[PDB]
Write an enzyme that holds these catalytic residues in place. Sequence first.
Site, PDB file in Angstrom:
ATOM      1  N   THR A   1       0.809  -1.223   0.000  1.00  0.00           N
ATOM      2  CA  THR A   1       0.000   0.000   0.000  1.00  0.00           C
ATOM      3  C   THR A   1       0.847   1.280   0.000  1.00  0.00           C
ATOM      4  O   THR A   1       1.980   1.282   0.481  1.00  0.00           O
ATOM      5  CB  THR A   1      -0.938   0.019   1.226  1.00  0.00           C
ATOM      6  OG1 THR A   1      -1.656  -1.220   1.288  1.00  0.00           O
ATOM      7  CG2 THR A   1      -1.918   1.174   1.174  1.00  0.00           C
ATOM      8  N   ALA A  49      -5.302  -5.742   5.662  1.00  0.00           N
ATOM      9  CA  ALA A  49      -6.542  -5.330   5.011  1.00  0.00           C
ATOM     10  C   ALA A  49      -7.728  -5.499   5.949  1.00  0.00           C
ATOM     11  O   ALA A  49      -8.537  -4.577   6.128  1.00  0.00           O
ATOM     12  CB  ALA A  49      -6.750  -6.130   3.726  1.00  0.00           C
TER      13      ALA A  49
HETATM   14  C1  LIG Z   1      -5.582 -10.382   0.430  1.00  0.00           C
HETATM   15  C2  LIG Z   1      -5.411  -9.757   1.812  1.00  0.00           C
HETATM   16  C3  LIG Z   1      -3.988  -9.892   2.349  1.00  0.00           C
HETATM   17  C4  LIG Z   1      -3.559  -8.595   3.024  1.00  0.00           C
HETATM   18  O1  LIG Z   1      -4.167  -8.175   3.952  1.00  0.00           O
HETATM   19  N1  LIG Z   1      -2.410  -7.867   2.528  1.00  0.00           N
HETATM   20  C5  LIG Z   1      -2.055  -6.628   3.189  1.00  0.00           C
HETATM   21  C6  LIG Z   1      -0.616  -6.604   3.710  1.00  0.00           C
HETATM   22  O2  LIG Z   1       0.163  -7.491   2.955  1.00  0.00           O
HETATM   23  C7  LIG Z   1      -2.313  -5.463   2.237  1.00  0.00           C
HETATM   24  O3  LIG Z   1      -2.826  -5.659   1.192  1.00  0.00           O
HETATM   25  N2  LIG Z   1      -1.919  -4.131   2.628  1.00  0.00           N
HETATM   26  C8  LIG Z   1      -2.120  -2.953   1.816  1.00  0.00           C
HETATM   27  C9  LIG Z   1      -3.288  -2.184   2.453  1.00  0.00           C
HETATM   28  C10 LIG Z   1      -4.717  -2.460   1.973  1.00  0.00           C
HETATM   29  C11 LIG Z   1      -4.993  -3.844   1.401  1.00  0.00           C
HETATM   30  C12 LIG Z   1      -5.779  -1.998   2.967  1.00  0.00           C
HETATM   31  C13 LIG Z   1      -0.863  -2.126   2.088  1.00  0.00           C
HETATM   32  O4  LIG Z   1      -0.825  -1.494   3.093  1.00  0.00           O
HETATM   33  C14 LIG Z   1       0.363  -2.210   1.163  1.00  0.00           C
HETATM   34  C15 LIG Z   1       1.619  -2.655   1.932  1.00  0.00           C
HETATM   35  O5  LIG Z   1       1.693  -2.101   3.225  1.00  0.00           O
HETATM   36  C16 LIG Z   1       0.079  -3.227   0.064  1.00  0.00           C
HETATM   37  O6  LIG Z   1       1.001  -4.268   0.230  1.00  0.00           O
END
Ligand SMILES: CCCC(=O)N[C@@H](CO)C(=O)N[C@@H](CC(C)C)C(=O)C(CO)CO
Lengths: 212, 241, 243, 249, 244, 231, 240, 241
Positions: A1, A49
């Site tokens: 993210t 997430a």
């Molecule tokens: C399929 C669900 C698996 C999951 O929860 N993945 C997390 C962390 O791996 C994620 O998607 N984090 C995003 C934030 C959003 C999704 C709210 C983010 O913050 C960046 C890195 O910080 C993207 O990588």
Amino acid sequence: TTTLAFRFQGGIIVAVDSRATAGNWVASQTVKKVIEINPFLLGTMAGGAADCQFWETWLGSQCRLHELREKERISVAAASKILSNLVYQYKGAGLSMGTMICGYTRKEGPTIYYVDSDGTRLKGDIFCVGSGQTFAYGVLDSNYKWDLSVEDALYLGKRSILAAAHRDAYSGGSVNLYHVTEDGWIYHGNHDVGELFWKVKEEEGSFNNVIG
Amino acid sequence: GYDRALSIFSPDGHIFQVEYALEAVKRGTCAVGVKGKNCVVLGCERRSTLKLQDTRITPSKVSKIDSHVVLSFSGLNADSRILIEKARVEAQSHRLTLEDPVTVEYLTRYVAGVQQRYTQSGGVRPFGVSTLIAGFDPRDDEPKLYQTEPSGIYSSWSAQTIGRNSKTVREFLEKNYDRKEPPATVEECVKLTVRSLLEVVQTGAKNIEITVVKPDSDIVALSSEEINQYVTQIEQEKQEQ
Amino acid sequence: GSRRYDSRTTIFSPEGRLYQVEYALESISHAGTAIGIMASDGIVLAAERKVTSTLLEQDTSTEKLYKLNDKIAVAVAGLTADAEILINTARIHAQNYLKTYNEDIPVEILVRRLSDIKQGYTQHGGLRPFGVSFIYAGYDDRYGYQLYTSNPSGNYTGWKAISVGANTSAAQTLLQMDYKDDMKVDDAIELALKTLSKTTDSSALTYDRLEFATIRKDGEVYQKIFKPQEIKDILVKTGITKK
Amino acid sequence: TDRYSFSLTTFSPSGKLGQIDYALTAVKQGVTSLGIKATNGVVIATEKKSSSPLAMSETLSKVSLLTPDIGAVYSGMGPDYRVLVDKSRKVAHTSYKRIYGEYPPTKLLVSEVAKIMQEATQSGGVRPFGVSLLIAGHDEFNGFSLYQVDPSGSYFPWKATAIGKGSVAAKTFLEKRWNDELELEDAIHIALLTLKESVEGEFNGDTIELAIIGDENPDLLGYTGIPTDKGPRFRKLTSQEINDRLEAL
Amino acid sequence: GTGYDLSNSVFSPDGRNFQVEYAVKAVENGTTSIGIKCNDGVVFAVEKLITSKLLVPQKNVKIQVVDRHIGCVYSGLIPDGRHLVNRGREEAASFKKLYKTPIPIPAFADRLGQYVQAHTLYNSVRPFGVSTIFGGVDKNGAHLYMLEPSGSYWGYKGAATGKGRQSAKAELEKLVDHHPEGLSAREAVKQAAKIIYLAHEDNKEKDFELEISWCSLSETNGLHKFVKGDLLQEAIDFAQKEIN
Amino acid sequence: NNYDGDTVTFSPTGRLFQVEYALEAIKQGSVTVGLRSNTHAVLVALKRNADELSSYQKKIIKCDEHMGLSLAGLAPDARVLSNYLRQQCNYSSLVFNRKLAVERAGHLLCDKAQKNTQSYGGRPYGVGLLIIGYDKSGAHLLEFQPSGNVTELYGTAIGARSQGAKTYLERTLDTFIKIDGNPDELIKAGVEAISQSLRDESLTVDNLSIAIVGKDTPFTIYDGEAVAKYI
Amino acid sequence: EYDRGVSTFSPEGRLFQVEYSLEAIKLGSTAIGIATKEGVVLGVEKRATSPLLESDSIEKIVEIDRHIGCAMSGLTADARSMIEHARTAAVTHNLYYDEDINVESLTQSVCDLALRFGEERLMSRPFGVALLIAGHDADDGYQLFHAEPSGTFYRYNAKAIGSGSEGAQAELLNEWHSSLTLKEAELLVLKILKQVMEEKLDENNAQLSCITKQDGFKIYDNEKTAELIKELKEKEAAES
Amino acid sequence: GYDRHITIFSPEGRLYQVEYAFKATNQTNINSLAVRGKDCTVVISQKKVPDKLLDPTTVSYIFCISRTIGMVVNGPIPDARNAALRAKAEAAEFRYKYGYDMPCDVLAKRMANLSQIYTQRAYMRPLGVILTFVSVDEELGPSIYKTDPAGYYVGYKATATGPKQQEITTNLENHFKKSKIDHINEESWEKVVEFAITHMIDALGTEFSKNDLEVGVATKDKFFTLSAENIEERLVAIAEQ
Ligand SMILES: CCCC(=O)N[C@@H](CO)C(=O)N[C@@H](CC(C)C)C(=O)C(CO)CO
Ligand SMILES: [Mg+2]
């Protein structure tokens, strides 16, 4: 993210990406990382997430209860502190979230608060949260100034999230843009990176590391 | 363990324990509160048995809940101590969680909620205490005066008295308080308050406490000499009317 | 069930009075008289022992005067056992304050804690209140010498001079007659002994029927519980007995 | 379930705690028991009133050891006294010996039993104890002492006293017979003489119970080898010793 | 004074617990129920007052089973009987879990007795408004017990409770006097049908439905089974012939 | 009368006056009838209204796809009991993959109600319940009283003036017991029964509630125009 | 009589404390509600006990949620616990289901709380307050519920509670028809309030509010209520 | 008034519920006595089976508490079985926690402490039973210890309980005044059983058959109860006396 929020002469600019990743797997490219808590309160999401989505929906519930009890809009400070005390109750349990509570109230003006699962709560003018925070920080800091036009500030947020989406593998998808004024927040569109990159490369002349 | 329902209904629709708590309030010292244009004055009656009493260490009837909000009462002083402690703790908690001091209405609603809870819980009796809560909301210059009863009811007042012989003071206030022209100066408000007390206080000053509340956490209790000045002014103007 | 046997000790009378508090005050009214007097440089506590006999040991007897810490003492009127319960709790609270703040507990804070403990029994729990009234004599740096009283209602007040127990009206009238603000501790000793001798129900006032204590001043505060010999000496010194 | 979570001892409008006065009344109907403090010991005595002559008197022991230097006697309801001595023996260990390694002073154990009794006059769903106790003890820093503990939890130190039926008469006797120059043997003698008036039936070692807190008894210790372990000061007199002291009256 | 009967567990000046006796009054107003211990088992029988013909026949069962070998019938407050049977089932379950063997009839009787008696120790509870005839076959043979609202239980050669308890008892005694060697299982079933028909005369205004169960070492292999089908009709016919 | 203070006091006669007062709370409730055949079971409910501007209170509660009840008395206690019954059916379905037999549901209600007639503090439930259900044993109709006594019947009625419908069903037994496979005729018989319990009223669309359960018919409730065909 | 329990039945089959609490509700301020097809209207008598009392601080009509309002009558202090419970129920249902709670479900939750009294800890006595819960959802449209401390609740086309409820109910029964308009309902509520009030009805001792599907739950400010009062006066003057 | 219903003090310092429980002990109209031998302790009790429908073998007031302790109860059988179960539990727990069989007097003291609790706590009623424990203690020899509803307990050279208690008591007192010893100078427990039955027939003035008696014998490391046939043997051997 990669999420970012900065305040300037014209209010607050909020800009997030939309990519969710389960490791190297791109789980989604169309994730809404801004929660619209109320017409004057937005919350960004970066980290787990489920943690971010669930606890910001719960924060919206708490702010509605506050409106019902006190017959008044909850302040940005109060909402950020609610979320902060909640995540601190779970400190060490494994919550992973990094959020920004952005808002305007007549009491404190426009305000940006950074909260994280560590329990840290910071008031600030510029913040970038997420795995790609450094990339956006570079562009944003290099082109930030308080007396920016609303157009220029919207474009600066868009371009910083774009630079982060370019260099960071775990950031990408589509830039979601918001402008917070004294009248509340105004959505400024979902801009897919697959076209915005080439548009900015052509108009701006930047991104000379790429073939095109 | 002890959960017997002490406050229950009577066939005529009355909770006798709450009404008897009101009775206990009726036999307590008189307390009066008057809203100025930019201040709130709280006056209190002391009992006339102060012979040998140490006024330096004795607890005063007006307790400060927070830097900007004060509370006086009528009834049993011990129940008042319990309520005041609860209110101060809640005020600090509200500062801690909201990063803003309590409003006078919010503190009033919390105290009234505690009192109401005590009329609904088993094994406990209601508070024999009625309260006047005065002050200014944070970053506001509009005075706030609220009153809570043992039943849990609370309401705002331009001026109000509770306690013994409070009906006389209430008649005086209803006669001499104009909503169109509240006491502009602090002096006028304190004068109205000491006059309201003197209607029932048959000893004069030294048996009168006066606390003035001004905006932005300005709270000052008048010394006995300033009260004596006001009382002498009232006695001089008494022959006139 | 058992609701028929519940006397409901924490209810209001139709006049707004607590039955048990009033009855416990009436109980205390028959307790031995205790007097406290606050001079400008000390505090004096005196009390008359209701329990009296030739065979009662006085050297090892503590019925009316008790140490709470090294700067605060109490005169008791009423049920001695309830008094000991409350005194133990007060000593514990004083030592808690000491452990927490590394300072001796201010007198009013301790008095207020004990009064809250008393009041608790009059609002919840369905138990009887404590049939004991206290006269607290203490010293702290903030207010100097302090004299307080606490009755079963949980209400507490501060006095220059005060009496609890039997003949409180007569003792209060006498103290109001003969009390002056600028007096010293020895004059207060004399006044307390005179009030106890004028309000006693016995023939003469002897050392065996009274307990005495002084909190006085080296820059330090000394708390003295008078021994029977010291009591006899102070009695013959103030002209109440001879030898 | 236990719905008795309220005080059964309340103030009457006159100020009396009715249950405490009635427990004191129950004590007044108890068998006479007395205590006399001397300069070299304390004596506590009582009458061993047995209901049936088929009952073995030795099992009905009214004098009970609390600590090796502290013993107890009572007047009132036997079973209350039995559970009280059990609680007292326990609290002597839990609240003191397991904390300081030494047995508690007489006054402190007396205050602990007084706290128990006061709880009985204020806790929910309970009557006060129907006994009055005489506790005779010795500690190093207060010497010998004799205390009386009432159902109210009030306790007082006595040079000598008595409780029960013959209380008034016995106390008058003691008042006119006690002096601060008294010896343990003279105190035992005065105790026997005072019991002789309060006992109408047979008066021998078999019908009276008498115990002393005197000097330490190394023969009653059970082991030798610790010079600091002096021995128990509490000693219950046998029927034979009582008879030997009765024959010389 | 007075008011001794207002609370449970209160001793009257003659040493009685009037609430238990009022519970016994509540029991006596119940339908008739009997138990007969025979040579190798026990039989239980009960009268079901058919208040109306809207009641579905053969339904609304009263005889209850504990474990697989204990039969229980009760007269009085039917819900109190169900509560007592539930408690007894818990007791039997715990006994089987700990000691493996099914709970013996005397052990089960003492479980029920301690439960019922405990319900007479406090003013916060009401004594049980049922009397219970129960029993079955254990390693020591057949056992029949009757348990009173007071918690008193005893072993019986035959037991009866309810309105027609008097007549029934008399009939039972005649059995004990006529053949002291004992009845067989089926003979005891027919005789229980007879006794229920005879004791129904105290409730002759309303029609009744007979209900019989038995636990016999030879006829049911120690298990508790309802007497139904041809044997039930045979017992009913025997009762009809004995009344006329 | 000193014996009606609580449920832990037997009267000298052997009576439980609080239970009797709960029964009297039922008798003051509105009338509802239940009946069954060999393939179906019907509840008819005349819901009472507070006045002409009021709503005729919900009087039939579904407990599972195969079981439901109608109430007469204190609606809150019927809510409590119906929720308990729903939880018991749900427990049966979840833990045993088994539809809870109606007889067992009656037993569970009996125990739940008996628990309140023997303990100090609290009261018996002031409701009577008519429980219909189709299970592995066919159709079933049960009458439940606050005393705890639950009885299985071919038909019954509870509430004000219920004796009229009771005697009607007593006479019509051999008729409606044989209405197998024709739900409309069973509902019409039930409506005639509940009509037999009217004094100064007449069934309309607003004050009628019907409930049906059967072989190939899950527990369904008809309110409003759905019942107009049966008036 | 203290010589019995709070959960004790009367020989007529009623709960003593419930009936007594209803008697207490009879002594409260008047609260009237009328449900139409253009919204629901709730009006209350503020009833000041002295001219010094600021009539604005008499909150007898509260917002449960944007689509559910409430009017209280009786021991209004007891209302606070119920109001917080209902607000929490609405917000929690929105949290769990991303939708507005049905008005009947909210009322049922309030009434589930209502009879949770007796002697595992519960409140000692029933509430001494009755509620008019007005709302709108898409399933049953506009609704007005009456909630008693008996745990029971009813639905009404119109309902009056508090002091002078009898005559108010009679007037509502006579003057309500299904085709009533919102403004007509406002005027009728004001009329019945003025009739049963012990003082002259003005905007200071009477509060008006409504629920419309479009604009949610709105409490009428003093000026709109005063204009409605003047319009009612004009309407009544034009009669013979 | 109410001081007669719960275990609180009457103005005369009396516990009426305890006295009424003592009265309830005699409800069964059964007498019993206990005597000590050279190395045994015998308890005889009356066996009254009124109903012909009763199984006489299940009609008992003697309980086998432990392998060494027997207990005969005078009172209603529900309270009797309550106390007996409690005593069995306490004896087993004692053997487990302290590694040796519970002494008779210690069990008596335990049950007496529980009785005292019942007389001091108001929620529990006293048990209307008198418990007589007999054993051959490893440190005291033949032992008889009795406990009553008052919480009192005491050992006996011999004892008797029931309605006709005083008559048997008098007979035993006279026999022991004549014999000048506190036990029965007999070596076999059968002779002591014979003595006990003889003196009960003499004191009560009624003959006994084998179905009219209950005999429990405690010997070293054993307590048993005689069958109807063993009692018949004792009676037949008595015939020659
Ligand atoms: C399929 C669900 C698996 C999951 O929860 N993945 C997390 C962390 O791996 C994620 O998607 N984090 C995003 C934030 C959003 C999704 C709210 C983010 O913050 C960046 C890195 O910080 C993207 O990588
Ligand atoms: Mg008891």
